[PDB]
Amino acid sequence: TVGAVVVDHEGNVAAAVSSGGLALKHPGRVGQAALYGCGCWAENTGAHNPYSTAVSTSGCGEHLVRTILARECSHALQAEDAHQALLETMQNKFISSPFLASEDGVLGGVIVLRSCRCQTLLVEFLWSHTTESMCVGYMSAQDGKAKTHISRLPPGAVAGQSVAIEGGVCRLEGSGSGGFVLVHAGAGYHSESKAKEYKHVCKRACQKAIEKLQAGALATDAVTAALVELEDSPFTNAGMGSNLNLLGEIECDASIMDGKSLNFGAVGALSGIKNPVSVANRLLCEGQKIPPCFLVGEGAYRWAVDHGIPSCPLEHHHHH
Amino acid sequence: TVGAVVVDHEGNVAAAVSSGGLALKHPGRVGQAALYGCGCWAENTGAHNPYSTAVSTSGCGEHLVRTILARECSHALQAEDAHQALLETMQNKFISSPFDGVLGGVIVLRSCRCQTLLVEFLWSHTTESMCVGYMSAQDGKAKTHISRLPPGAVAGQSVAIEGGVCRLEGSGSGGFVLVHAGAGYHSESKAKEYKHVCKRACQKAIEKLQAGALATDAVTAALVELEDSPFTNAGMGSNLNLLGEIECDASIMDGKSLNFGAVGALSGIKNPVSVANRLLCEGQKRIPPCFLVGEGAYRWAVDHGIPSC
Numbered sequence: 001t002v003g004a005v006v007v008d009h010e011g012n013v014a015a016a017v018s019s020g021g022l023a024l025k026h027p028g029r030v031g032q033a034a035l036y037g038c039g040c041w042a043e044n045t046g047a048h049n050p051y052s053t054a055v056s057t058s059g060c061g062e063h064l065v066r067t068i069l070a071r072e073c074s075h076a077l078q079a080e081d082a083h084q085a086l087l088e089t090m091q092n093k094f095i096s097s098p099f100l101a102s103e104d105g106v107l108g109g110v111i112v113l114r115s116c117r118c119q120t121l122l123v124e125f126l127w128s129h130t131t132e133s134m135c136v137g138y139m140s141a142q143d144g145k146a147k148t149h150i151s152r153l154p155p156g157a158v159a160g161q162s163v164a165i166e167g168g169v170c171r172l173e174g175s176g177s178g179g180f181v182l183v184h185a186g187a188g189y190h191s192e193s194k195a196k197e198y199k200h201v202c203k204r205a206c207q208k209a210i211e212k213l214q215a216g217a218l219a220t221d222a223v224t225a226a227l228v229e230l231e232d233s234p235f236t237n238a239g240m241g242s243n244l245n246l247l248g249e250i251e252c253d254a255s256i257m258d259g260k261s262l263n264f265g266a267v268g269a270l271s272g273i274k275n276p277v278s279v280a281n282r283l284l285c286e287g288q289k290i291p292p293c294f295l296v297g298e299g300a301y302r303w304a305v306d307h308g309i310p311s312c313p314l315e316h317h318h319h320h
Numbered sequence: 321t322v323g324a325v326v327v328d329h330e331g332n333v334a335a336a337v338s339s340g341g342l343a344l345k346h347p348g349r350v351g352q353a354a355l356y357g358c359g360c361w362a363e364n365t366g367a368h369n370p371y372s373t374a375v376s377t378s379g380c381g382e383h384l385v386r387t388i389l390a391r392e393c394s395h396a397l398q399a400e401d402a403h404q405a406l407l408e409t410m411q412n413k414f415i416s417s418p419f420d421g422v423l424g425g426v427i428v429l430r431s432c433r434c435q436t437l438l439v440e441f442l443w444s445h446t447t448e449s450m451c452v453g454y455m456s457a458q459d460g461k462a463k464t465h466i467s468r469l470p471p472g473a474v475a476g477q478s479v480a481i482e483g484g485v486c487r488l489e490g491s492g493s494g495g496f497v498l499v500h501a502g503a504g505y506h507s508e509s510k511a512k513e514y515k516h517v518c519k520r521a522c523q524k525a526i527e528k529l530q531a532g533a534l535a536t537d538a539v540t541a542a543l544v545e546l547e548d549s550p551f552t553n554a555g556m557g558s559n560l561n562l563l564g565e566i567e568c569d570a571s572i573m574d575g576k577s578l579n580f581g582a583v584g585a586l587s588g589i590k591n592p593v594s595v596a597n598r599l600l601c602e603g604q605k606r607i608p609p610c611f612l613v614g615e616g617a618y619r620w621a622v623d624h625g626i627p628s629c
């Protein structure tokens with residue numbers, strides 16, 4: 001599972017997530033990366049909530065679905081202390097949820113950003129996870145150098161039971177064409193090898209999002225360009241290199257949310273398309289112009305092909 | 321879209337929903353009846369919420385998805401005034417949501433111990449009409465009712481809300497069920513058949529409860545009866561998609577275990593709720609799947625002996 005969250009120079013936020021799902025899963029199994037409220041969330045500031053907030057999840061399985069975690073994090077981040085709010089959410093609504101009571105260990109994570117104007121923009125960004133490790137990258141259009149970091153649980157922590165949480169704060173000039181992106185290449189077991197490859201795909205994903213923002217793109221188009229980069233790494237469980245299901249086939253889940261319009265696009269159990277996030281983003285894009293927001297399986301593939309999204313007929317399965 | 325909510329003689333609740341989705345939808349479009357939190361919700365009383373609560377939605381489109389309505393209703397029903405809470409939610413988190421005119425509805429129940437069991441049940445809709453049925457194991461006669469918007473109301477802008485109260489003896493093998501056959505345009509004809517299918521749905525759920533069945537099996541038995549009516553947009557008679565085929569969404573949640581099962585874009589299976597219930601039942605025993613779609617869901621259903629069509 002890979003993810004990204006973006007804020008543009010106006011405080012418009014977007015979020016997206018993409019995943020291959022569990023290895024050896026039954027065909028047609030859909031997990032959190034496709035599910036509204038669960039895999040990602042983006043919500044601009046409004047009357048009821050003073051921050052623009054964007055959230056994307058990491059890890060896989062049903063833990064992130066049962067707790068509707070991305071939306072839960074977004075709502076908690078309307079409290080003053082963002083760090084305390086996220087930590088409480090991870091401890092109380094994730095690790096100690098009653099929805100995961102008979103579960104021995106809860107494995108997952110989030111990337112978060114929230115912004116507010118003060119004309120300048122204050123951006124707080126955080127990551128948190130209960131896995132051994134998580135790889136993040138982040139970048140603002142002004143700093144012009146992506147930063148990458150491998151977040152680990154400290155000694156004495158217990159994976160699936162302890163929380164790690166880190167973050168930072170960034171002030172932007174909301175005058176030009178700037179913004180900020182935070183991405184993650186996955187949260188799971190530590191891997192000393194390929195650790196450099198996860199950091200470098202996070203660096204490249206941040207750069208693609210920043211370049212889109214610097215060319216005037218919408219936050220949804222910038223967060224999508226970051227996820228395309230993350231998907232395309234053979235080392236991430238999303239897009240190319242996704243875990244194979246029980247029949248040895250690839251089935252991808254992906255979704256995206258726009259904070260300004262609150263519209264959403266998602267695909268589930270999608271095979272034969274190089275970049276599942278591209279279909280979710282196109283579903284969101286066409287909805288802006290009742291249009292569908294969530295397509296699965298054969299229908300999602302045919303819809304993607306009819307909208308000129310690069311396909312793979314040899315990688316597409318249609319059982320009957 | 322059809323739905324049911326059940327509470328058993330112990331106060332365990334369950335909820336389920338099933339739908340054919342939008343007429344002429346693009347193949348593979350999945351709507352609220354398959355989506356966790358959106359189509360149905362069931363949650364026994366716990367530390368954060370003093371009532372056991374079950375919710376099932378009605379209508380189609382994406383309005384019920386965008387507001388995660390079933391869970392939202394469940395959380396609002398933790399306030400004292402259940403009627404006020406549901407109305408506020410329908411007006412504030414549904415009609416006036418930040419997410420011109422929104423068409424849908426809900427059935428809800430909430431229960432608490434007093435050894436006696438107090439069950440409050442409500443339905444609400446912004447559609448012209450909605451057909452519901454309800455029954456307790458003690459009264460032994462199902463009641464069906466057509467809820468309509470009052471004169472002068474405008475569908476998608478006004479709210480209708482009604483409900484009742486039921487006291488159960490929490491000692492025997494009783495319970496209570498509330499069902500709906502859909503919320504949409506009023507139909508003077510076939511209204512008798514919508515009431516009749518709700519009546520049969522309640523009786524099946526009550527019969528299961530009286531045989532010692534779980535609340536999830538009882539709510540499943542209600543939805544199987546609702547699906548099989550050619551007049552409901554679920555199971556048999558589902559709206560055909562853009563290519564002239566049936567693709568069903570269904571889900572079910574257990575208040576006691578909080579487990580969940582769901583199918584989306586399911587073709588070729590007579591009773592989609594049976595598959596969702598079977599996914600839930602297998603989960604009770606690596607994390608087993610709770611949400612299957614498309615050809616994979618069909619193959620799983622047939623491999624588990626669930627009748628095809």
Ligand SMILES: */C=C/S(=O)(=O)N1CCN(Cc2ccc(OC(F)(F)F)c(F)c2)[C@@H](COCC#C)C1
Nearest residue numbers: 321379380449451501502503504506507552553
């Ligand atoms: C949005 C579409 S739907 O929710 O699938 N849908 C609404 C309900 N329809 C049947 C129905 C209409 C009105 C009812 O109330 C009554 F008038 F009081 F009877 C009712 F109970 C059910 C669905 C029928 O779709 C076509 C078919 C089959 C559509």
Ligand SMILES: */C=C\S(=O)(=O)N1CCN(Cc2ccc(OC(F)(F)F)c(F)c2)[C@@H](COCC#C)C1
Nearest residue numbers: 001059060133135185186188190191235236237
């Ligand atoms: C449920 C499993 S998953 O969320 O799809 N998944 C977890 C992440 N995996 C790759 C990964 C591991 C560790 C990382 O951080 C670290 F150690 F610092 F480098 C990381 F960034 C990514 C993922 C890969 O699975 C096989 C593939 C491809 C599995």
Ligand SMILES: [Cl-]
Nearest residue numbers: 025026029609
């Ligand atoms: Cl599986």
Ligand SMILES: [Cl-]
Nearest residue numbers: 292345346349
């Ligand atoms: Cl459609």
Ligand code: NA
Nearest residue numbers: 231236238240
């Ligand atoms: Na990949």
Ligand code: NA
Nearest residue numbers: 547552554556
């Ligand atoms: Na039917």
